[PDB]
């Protein structure tokens, strides 16, 4: 039934940047409502109860034709990722491991920051922005998705996700995404979480060179 996964910090941890009421509404009401709808939908079907969360997301989204299940499940997964993609008083420069990959694939941290801001600004409507790995090419890339679409659906491992829905930044920032995205990239991202996710993704994607024998 996938009970609520608590964020790794209290609802007032990010008060100077994300208001306590914003955390109470985003997680207490919205995420809980999505999960409750998913629970009601899971009660009926029994072939969807035997599916993992990733399998449920990947199956209820058909090959382009979502069932009356994709929205709620994908929203629940995306919000889990979003909550786990922060840390109190975090941000700033990255740490070892991730920095070399970003520099190799993007060029420098400021380059990544500019590309992330630009790709967040070029979204219309409600959606999410992502920094994900890419299989079959092994390269970090900034990607964009609309509504409740996730980069998982085409064999991409998400590493960082940012909510661009208007229901996130309206209690304190009203009608501008510049302040919201700048605050997220400055004092809200969790390079520890991104590093952990990249380390886990290293199991399924090999970012390295083989040890060829001299022979």
């Amino acid at each position: 039934y996938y009970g609520l996964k608590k964020p790794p910090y209290n609802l007032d941890a990010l008060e100077p940047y994300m208001s306590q009421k914003t955390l109470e509404s985003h997680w207490g009401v919205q995420h809980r409502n999505y999960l409750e709808a998913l629970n009601r939908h899971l009660s009926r079907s029994d072939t969807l109860y035997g599916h993992t969360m990733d399998e449920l997301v990947k199956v209820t989204y058909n090959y382009g034709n979502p069932l009356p299940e994709f929205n709620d499940a994908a929203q629940v997964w995306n919000h889990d990722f979003f909550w786990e993609s922060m840390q109190p008083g975090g941000g700033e420069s990255p740490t070892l491991g991730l920095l070399q990959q970003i520099e190799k694939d993007f060029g420098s941290f400021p380059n990544f920051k500019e590309k992330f801001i630009e790709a967040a600004m070029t979204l219309f409507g409600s959606g999410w922005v992502w920094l994900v790995l890419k299989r079959k090419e092994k390269q970090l890339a900034v990607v964009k998705t609309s509504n409740a679409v996730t980069p998982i659906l085409w064999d991409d491992i998400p590493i960082i996700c940012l909510d661009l829905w208007e229901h996130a930044y309206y209690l304190d920032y009203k009608n501008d995404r510049a302040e919201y995205v700048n605050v997220f990239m400055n004092h809200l991202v969790s390079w520890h979480a991104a590093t952990a996710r990249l380390a886990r993704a290293q199991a399924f994607v090999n970012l390295g060179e083989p040890k060829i024998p001299v022979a």
Binding site: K5, D46, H51, G64, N206
Partner: protein
């Protein structure tokens, strides 16, 4: 290029790997004596040894002077040659605090269980969300008993009855579908030891331990987890050149389930990754799609793909938009109305214009003349046009499907008008009868279907372009 990148090309692309060859002493001498020349004195060291080792009595002298007795001098030629890697070391990431919850895919489809019992069980799944700190982990109760596992106990009772009932059925089916035994198949027959776990006992997320009982060069390592179905860690190609120096037969390892699959369709139903040791830094070639079974029972190749969730067979792009196109106006039933209408007039004009042919014209209740069957119509008849024999159409339209009463009254009404119009000369306005009105009506109904289907595409194309969903189905 040089032999540092060109050699690299063979490994990464063409799968080259310097697998060691176990040459017999007769074949060993050939490789170490053909470098010098055709027929020259053999003065090269390590070549005289090969020549001197052709005598078995000298091999006995060599081994005994080094020792190792027998049965070990034979086994020392199979050793890996080259860069012998330093041995594995497996760290961890903290305590292995675990829950004990029933697998989600319970009960199996077809099995019947009281839903109230499961509604109590399913609360265990909903509890796999809270996290645990090192605080409250120092408060280990440490009393060896009094474990509050209750929902898992209920699942064990239900699972235990399931095993004792369907075991005979399951073993019979495995003897029916799969002919021979391969790792990843049902452990049937003499190899079935009572007490093995079944497939429903497993689920992704669980961390297991087992022994490595089989290494396959093209499939990976098969670890006996403890069930009727073995595990499968996908390792292929030349990755085994380094991995084989870490994983050996009989090793006890700790694994985690990534995904369990249907044993009937997918070849290896259990997929695992090595948690102890960790060889994630050595794996480079990975399976894009899990292996499956292509059985004779699968008659349609477009149902097989939906079973395994594989991309369909691509079709060459026609290039047309399929958005602006002639709307369909034909109707399937019209091609039978043409046969029905023709049969009416073929019998009518042979009944009223020539009434004496069939004495009485009782078309209000007329019965059939010849026995008719629905599933035969081969009417082509080799119709000749004074040139050659080319097929035409004269098909069977037995009166069972024929409604003569409607046309019987109508033709007399039309025949009255033509005989009364010879005098005054009024234009005989007869162009459409009852059947020919149904032809245009049914073509109108099919037009409405094709009208809205093209109408809904206008909104559908716009929606899938404002968001990003595909327009043409993948592949």
């Amino acid at each position: 290029e040089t032999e540092e990148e060109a050699r690299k090309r063979n490994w990464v692309e063409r799968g080259w790997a310097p697998w060691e060859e176990i040459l017999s002493p007769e074949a060993d001498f050939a490789r170490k004596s053909l470098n010098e020349g055709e027929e020259v004195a053999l003065k090269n060291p390590d070549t005289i040894e090969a020549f001197k080792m052709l005598k078995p009595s000298y091999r006995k002298k060599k081994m005994e002077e080094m020792g190792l007795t027998e049965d070990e001098y034979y086994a020392r030629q199979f050793d890996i040659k080259g860069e012998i890697l330093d041995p594995l070391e497996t760290y961890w990431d903290g305590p292995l605090v675990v829950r004990h919850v029933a697998p989600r895919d319970w009960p199996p489809p077809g099995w019947e269980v009281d839903r109230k019992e499961l509604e109590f069980i399913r609360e265990g799944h909903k509890m796999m969300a809270e996290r645990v700190d090192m605080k409250e982990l120092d408060n280990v109760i440490r009393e060896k008993e009094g474990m509050c596992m209750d929902r898992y106990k209920v699942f064990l009772k239900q699972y235990q009855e399931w095993v004792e009932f369907n075991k005979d059925k399951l073993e019979e089916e495995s003897y029916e579908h799969d002919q021979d035994y391969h790792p990843g198949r049902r452990k049937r027959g003499k190899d079935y030891e009572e007490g093995m776990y079944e497939l429903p006992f497993y689920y992704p997320g669980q961390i297991c331990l087992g022994k490595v009982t089989t290494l396959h060069l093209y499939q990976g390592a098969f670890v006996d987890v403890g069930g009727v179905y073995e595990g499968w860690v996908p390792i292929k190609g030349n990755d085994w050149y380094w991995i084989r120096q870490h994983i050996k037969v009989g090793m006890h390892v700790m694994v985690e389930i990534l995904a369990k699959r249907d044993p009937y369709r997918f070849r290896f139903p259990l997929e695992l990754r090595f948690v102890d040791p960790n060889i994630d830094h050595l794996l480079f070639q990975r399976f894009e799609y899990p292996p499956i079974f292509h059985r004779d029972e699968d008659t349609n190749l477009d149902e097989l793909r939906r079973d395994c969730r594989r991309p369909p067979f691509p079709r060459k792009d026609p290039g047309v938009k399929v958005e602006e196109e002639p709307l369909l106006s034909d109707h399937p039933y019209v091609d039978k109305l043409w046969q029905i209408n023709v049969a009416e007039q073929m019998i009518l004009d042979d009944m009223e214009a020539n009434p004496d042919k069939y004495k009485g014209k009782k078309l209000s209740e007329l019965t059939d003349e010849e026995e008719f069957d629905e599933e035969h119509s081969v009417e082509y008849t080799k119709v000749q046009y004074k040139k050659s024999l080319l097929p035409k159409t004269i098909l069977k339209t037995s009166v069972k499907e024929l409604d003569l009463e409607s046309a019987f009254a109508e033709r007399q009404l039309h025949n009255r008008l033509q005989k009364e119009a010879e005098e005054r000369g009024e234009d005989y306005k007869v162009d459409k009868l009852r059947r020919n009105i149904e032809m245009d009506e049914y073509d109108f109904i099919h037009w409405r279907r094709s009208f809205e289907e093209r109408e809904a595409l206008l909104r559908d194309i716009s929606c899938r372009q404002a968001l990003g969903l595909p327009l043409q189905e993948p592949g």
